[PDB]
């Protein structure tokens, strides 16, 4: 969980099997096997099997924050080429994973948008040839309803921060709705897209008083709607506009743009929700649909004058108004 | 459901066990459509068979209250707020979901689709209007389709009336009943209101449901 | 200089017995949805009468009534049926305030 900061640790991690010895942990979890979920009921193989995946997602969490700054070094040196960069590179043992998901891991996810839009990761090639992003949806699915505290509040939150670094891959945004091999609380094999689960999380019907989860949820959306302008790479982002418009994604954001109960991060959610509307309302049909709503009748203005939390006023309320007059 | 006979002989002519809610068809009354849950079944009255069962899980809004209805030209079906081609058995277009309850009704001019408070198109699927007084109400028209009624389905049931215009949706009048309204039906020849109202307060143990008649347009 | 003093005294007693408390609540009443617009226009008429008092000008002018939502009781039209009937005489007492 910590020793991935040293680059030679990751170097020996990939000359061996790597995630093939890591994914085989999650794929052998008997709490995930829907065909055999009613087999074991003793609490020895339950509390230990709902903890084993929790540390595994955190093993993934610092894995991808590390490989985000690795490829950012393979972006800021191969693309910049002395234009704002200094080519000094000793390959040292040195901690350069930026160590803050509150500020700068969030920020490193943004500057990858200026890449080639032909993003190739050896973190991604082993990932989607095994194609376990569908399994990641099943980890979020089963964790919805346990209700007896198998340290499960953080377990889905560690599951979400696998996503927010992976969601900048274009072909994994192709696989956000295609495969629908999931299950729900009705006790049957069903099929819904992966976007509807995150939107089901982003509403808050499940996971009632959680706060970091929704702000880890909105970064999944903002990766998919507020991209750049660049006849095939434009079509993928145009398709992503259509699926959020398909699976009622315009419903959720109009409610999260007025959320008020977790009074610490009241201003941190709306500014990270209004950023999605500026991304999505570049779509041709969706311009006319939002522009007639009671959002633009009134009270869009009256979310700019109240300052409900006066402590993030000069901190995060004033970047909400950067996304407000942009809308 | 019980497809009775009212000519001279009282008998269930055909019988349905599956669907929660049915309706006649408007122009040609040879069709009675049926829907349990979210799946719409087109039936006949002559034979009683599933003529065209249409349902697509790929494009289902999946509401709470679905009611399959025909346009008055009898060519379109609203299953889960989706238009449906009855000719070549394909879906047309899905609408967005806003209040979790009501699937969508037609308007008797054959130009619109009235989702709960979103007023749509039929050929370009744009939005015309959005009324804040259409929050979760069931609509009742005149037979010609020139005035709209509204009853609240909130928990209280229908605190007052709601009378709309069928052209530009400027509301006419909300006269008030002190009790709670349950059912509301009018005439084909436009003279009465069958009002099933709830005597007494909000009591599940005592529901006194009298029937009262209203005269259209008299002080 | 005596008939002016009686109305000046009447301003003082409403200001004494917390009369400024009540009208700020009746200017946003919403439950009897028939006469929602009939109460506020017959309440805002009192504020235009009372806020000619010297001390009371400064007291009402700093409240959250004049921070916001005085404007947002003029744009909603909550009861669309008294719109051309009694909502538009509320705005006669609104820009007068």
Alpha carbons A280 and B96: distance in angstroms, whole number: 15
Residue A191 CA to its chain's centroid (Å): 21
| B162, B137 contact by CB (below 8 A) | yes
Residues of A in contact with C76 (CB under 8 A): 298
Length of chain B: 219
| Cα B63 off chain centre by | 14
Resolution, expressed in angstroms to one decimal:
4.2
CA distance A221 to A272: 10
Contact (CB, 8 A) for A2 and A62 = yes
3-state secondary structure of C67: coil
| DSSP per-residue letters across B86-148 | TTTTEEEEE---SSSSB--EE-TTSS-EEETTEE--SSS----EE-TT-TTEEEEE-SSS-EE
The sheet that has B192-199: what strands, in order across it?
B180-186, B192-199, B208-215
Q: Whole-angstrom distance between the N-terminal and C-terminal Cα of chain A?
A: 40
Answer whether B139's CB lies under 8 Å from B105's CB: yes
Contacts of A245 in chain B (CB under 8 A): 96
Which residue pairs from A264-268 have beta carbons closer than 8 angstroms and sit at least 24 positions apart in sequence? Answer: A264/A211, A264/A309, A265/A211, A265/A215, A266/A308, A266/A309, A267/A308, A267/A309, A267/A312, A267/A316, A267/A317, A267/A320, A268/A215, A268/A312, A268/A316
Q: After which residues is chain A broken (C to N over 2.5 A)?
A: 230
Cβ-contact C43, C27 below 8 angstroms: yes
Contacts of B195 (CB under 8 A, 6+ apart): B177, B181, B183, B184, B211, B212, B213, B214
- Burial class of C65 by CB neighbour count within 10 A (0 to 12, 13 to 18, 19+): middle
Consecutive H or E run containing B194: strand B192-199
Sign, CA torsion B112/B113/B117/B120: negative
A253 to chain B: closest CA residue: B98
Q: What whole-number distance in Å separates Cα of residue B32 and Cα of residue B43?
A: 5
Interface of chain C against chain B, CB under 8 Å? 33-34, 79-81
Token code pair at residue B110: 């054959």
Cα–Cα distance measured from residue C18 to residue C20, given in angstroms and rounded to the nearest whole number:
5
The whole-angstrom separation of Cα A185 and Cα A141 is 9
Specify the length of chain C in residues. Answer: 97
Q: Which of B147, B148, B152, B170 to mutate to test the interface with C (most CBs of C within 10 A)?
A: B170
Greatest Cα-to-Cα distance within chain B, rounded to the nearest angstrom = 52
Q: Which residues pair with B115 in a beta bridge?
A: B118
Q: How many residues does chain A have?
A: 327
- Round the CA-based radius of gyration of chain A to a whole number and report it: 21
A132 and A175 in contact (C-beta within 8 Å)? no
Reported for A187-196, long-range contacts at CB under 8 A and 24+ positions apart, including other chains, are A189/A34, A191/B57, A193/A243, A193/A247, A194/A133, A194/A134, A194/A137, A195/A243, A195/A244, A195/A247, A195/A249, A196/A247
* Angle (CA) B108 B109 B115, round 5°: 65
Burial (CB count within 10 angstroms: exposed 0-12, middle 13-18, buried 19+), residue B87: exposed
Hey, what are A223's tokens?
């990766």
**Nearest in space to A220 (alpha carbons), one of A249, A235, A198:** A198
For testing the chain C interface, which of A300, A303, A304, A306 should be mutated: the one with the most C CBs within 10 Å?
A306
The Cα–Cα gap between B94 and A33 comes to 35
- Here the tokens at position B57 are 């899980």
The residue among C31, B156, B62, B161 whose CA lies nearest residue A196 is B62
- Long-range contacts formed by A12-18: CB under 8 A, 24+ apart: A14/A122, A18/A126
Say how far apart CA B68 and CA A163 lie, in whole Å.
39
Question: Do C33 and B174 make contact, defined as CB atoms within 8 angstroms?
Answer: yes
**Closest to B195 in 3D by CA, of B216, B211, B209:** B211
Rounded distance between C-alpha atoms, residue B151 and residue B146, angstroms: 17
Report CA A198 to chain centroid distance, whole Å. 9
Out of A248, A289, A297, the one facing B127 most closely (by C-beta) is A289
Helix, strand or coil, per DSSP, at residue B45: coil
Which technique was the structure solved with, according to the deposited record?
cryo-EM
**Chain A partners within 8 Å of B129 (Cβ):** 292
Q: For residue B160, which residues of chain C lie inside 8 Å, CB to CB?
A: 33-34
Q: Give the separation between CA B110 and CA B104, rounded to whole angstroms.
A: 14
- Among the listed residues A286, A192, A277, A200, the one whose alpha carbon sits nearest the alpha carbon of residue A242: A286
Cα(B65)–Cα(B79) distance, integer angstroms: 11
Which tokens belong to A226?
Answer: 């507020």
What are B9's two structure tokens? 């002989």
Look up residue C71 and give its DSSP letter.
Answer: G
CB A250 within 8 A of CB A244: yes
- Looking at beta carbons, which pairs linking B27-33 to residues 24 or more positions away fall under 8 Å? B27/B72, B27/B73, B27/B74, B28/B74, B31/B70, B31/B74, B32/B3, B33/B68, B33/B69, B33/B70, B33/B77
Say which residues have a Cβ less than 8 Å from residue A315's Cβ, sequence separation at least 6. none
Phi and psi at residue C86, in whole multiples of 5°?
-130, -15
d(CA A275, CA A215): 12
Question: Per the structure block, which two tokens stand in for B151?
Answer: 């009853």
Residue A149 Rama label (left phi>0; alpha psi -120 to 50; beta): left
Query: Per the structure block, which two tokens stand in for A34?
Result: 């829907």
CB distance B11 to B18 below 8 Å:
no
CA distances from A302 to A281, A321, B127, B171 (A): 21, 12, 24, 27
* B134, B151 Cβ separation under 8 angstroms: no
Torsion of CA A260, A266, A271, A277, to 10 degrees: -20
| C68/A299 touch (CB, cutoff 8 Å), yes or no | no
* Element holding B39 (H helix, E strand): strand B39-44
Query: Which residues in chain A have their CB less than 8 angstroms from residue C80's CB?
Result: none
Interface residues of chain B, partner chain C, Cβ below 8 Å: 133, 159-160, 170-174, 176
Q: How far is CA A117 from the centre of its chain?
A: 19
C contacts of B152 (beta carbons < 8 Å) = none
Q: Considering Cα of A53, then A57, then A58, then A60, what sign does the dihedral take? A: positive
Q: Do A306 and C75 touch (CB under 8 A)?
A: no
Start-to-end CA span in chain C (Å): 26
Nearest to B133 by CA among B95, B177, B174: B174
Q: Is the CB of A288 less than 8 angstroms away from the CB of B126?
A: yes
Residue B212 β-bridge partners: B195
Say which of A191, A246, A294 has its CB closest to residue B130.
A294
Distances from the Cα of A180 to the Cαs of A11, A192, B37, C20, in angstroms?
35, 5, 22, 61
DSSP-based three-state secondary structure for A212: helix
Rounded Cα distance, A246 and A290, in Å: 14
CB A223 within 8 A of CB A168: yes
**φ, ψ at B58 (rounded to 5°):** -65, -25
**The sheet that has B113-115: what strands, in order across it?**
B105-106, B113-115, B118-119, B129-130
C-alpha closest to that of A38 among A144, A192, A187, A191: A187
Q: Which two tokens stand for residue C13?
A: 């007693």
Residue B160 β-bridge partners:
B176
Q: Gaps after which residues in chain C, C–N over 2.5 Å?
A: none
Cβ proximity of B158 and B99 under 8 Å: no
CB A160 within 8 A of CB A211: no
Nearest to A290 by CA among A303, A281, A279, A302: A281
Q: What is the largest CA-CA distance in chain C?
A: 46
Question: How is residue A66 written in tokens?
Answer: 């590390």
**Does residue A111 sit in helix, strand or coil?**
helix
**Closest-CA residue in chain A for B96?**
A248
Give the C-alpha distances (Å, rounded to integers) separating A324 from A145, A247, A255, A267: 37, 25, 16, 13
8 Å CB contact between A195 and A243: yes
Q: B174 in helix, strand or coil?
A: coil
Cβ distance of A248 and B61 shorter than 8 Å: yes
């Amino acid at each position: 969980s910590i020793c991935f900061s040293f680059r030679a640790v990751l170097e020996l991690f990939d000359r061996y099997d790597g995630l093939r010895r890591l994914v085989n942990l999650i794929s052998t979890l008997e709490i995930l096997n829907l065909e055999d979920q009613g087999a074991l009921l003793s609490d020895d193989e339950i509390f230990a099997s709902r903890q084993t995946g929790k540390h595994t997602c955190m093993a993934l969490r610092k894995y991808f924050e590390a490989h985000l700054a690795i490829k950012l070094e393979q972006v800021k040196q191969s693309l910049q080429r002395t234009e704002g960069g200094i080519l000094v590179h000793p390959q040292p043992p040195y901690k350069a994973c930026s160590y803050t998901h509150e500020q700068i891991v969030e920020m490193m996810e943004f500057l990858i948008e200026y890449g080639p839009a032909q993003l190739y990761w050896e973190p991604a090639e082993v990932f989607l040839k095994l194609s376990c992003v569908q399994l990641l949806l099943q980890l979020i699915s089963i964790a919805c309803n346990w209700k007896t505290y198998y340290a499960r509040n953080d377990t889905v939150r560690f599951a979400l921060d696998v996503l927010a670094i992976l969601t900048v891959v274009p072909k994994i945004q192709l696989q956000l709705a295609e495969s629908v091999d999931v299950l729900d609380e009705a006790g049957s094999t069903v099929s819904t897209v992966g976007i509807s689960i995150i939107l089901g999380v982003a509403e808050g019907e499940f996971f009632i008083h959680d706060a970091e989860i929704q702000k880890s949820a909105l970064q999944i959306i903002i990766n998919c709607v507020c991209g750049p302008d660049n006849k095939s790479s434009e079509h993928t982002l145009a398709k992503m506009w259509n699926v959020v418009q398909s699976n009622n994604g315009i419903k959720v954001l109009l409610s999260l743009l007025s959320i008020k109960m977790p009074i610490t991060d009241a201003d941190q959610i709306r500014a990270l929700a209004c950023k999605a509307l500026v991304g999505l309302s570049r779509s041709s049909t969706v311009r006319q649909i939002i522009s007639k709503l009671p959002l633009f009748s009134s009270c869009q203005i009256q979310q700019l004058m109240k300052e409900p939390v006066l402590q993030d006023k000069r901190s995060d309320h004033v970047k909400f108004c950067k996304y407000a007059a942009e809308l | 459901s019980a497809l009775w006979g009212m000519k001279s002989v009282f008998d269930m002519k055909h019988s349905f066990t599956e669907d929660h809610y049915v309706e006649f068809s408007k122009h040609s009354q040879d069709r009675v459509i049926g829907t349990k849950g979210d799946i719409a079944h087109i039936y006949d009255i002559q034979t009683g068979n599933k003529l065209l069962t249409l349902f697509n899980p790929d494009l289902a809004n999946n509401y709470k209250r679905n009611c399959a209805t025909f346009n008055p030209t009898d060519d379109l079906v609203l299953n889960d707020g989706v238009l449906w081609d009855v000719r070549s058995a394909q879906a047309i277009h899905k609408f967005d979901k806003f209040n979790m309850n009501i699937s969508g009704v037609f308007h008797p001019n054959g130009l619109e689709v009235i989702i709960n408070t979103e007023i749509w198109d039929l050929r370009t699927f744009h939005l015309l209007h959005t009324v804040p007084a259409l929050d979760q109400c069931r609509v009742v028209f005149n037979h010609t389709g020139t005035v709209m009624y509204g009853a609240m389905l909130q928990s209280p049931f229908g605190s007052s009336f709601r009378t709309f215009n069928a052209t530009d949706y400027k509301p006419i009048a909300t006269i008030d009943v002190k009790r709670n309204i349950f059912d509301l039906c009018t005439d084909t020849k436009d003279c009465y209101l069958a009002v099933i109202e709830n005597q007494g307060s909000m009591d599940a143990l005592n529901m006194d449901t009298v029937c009262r008649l209203y005269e259209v347009g008299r002080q």
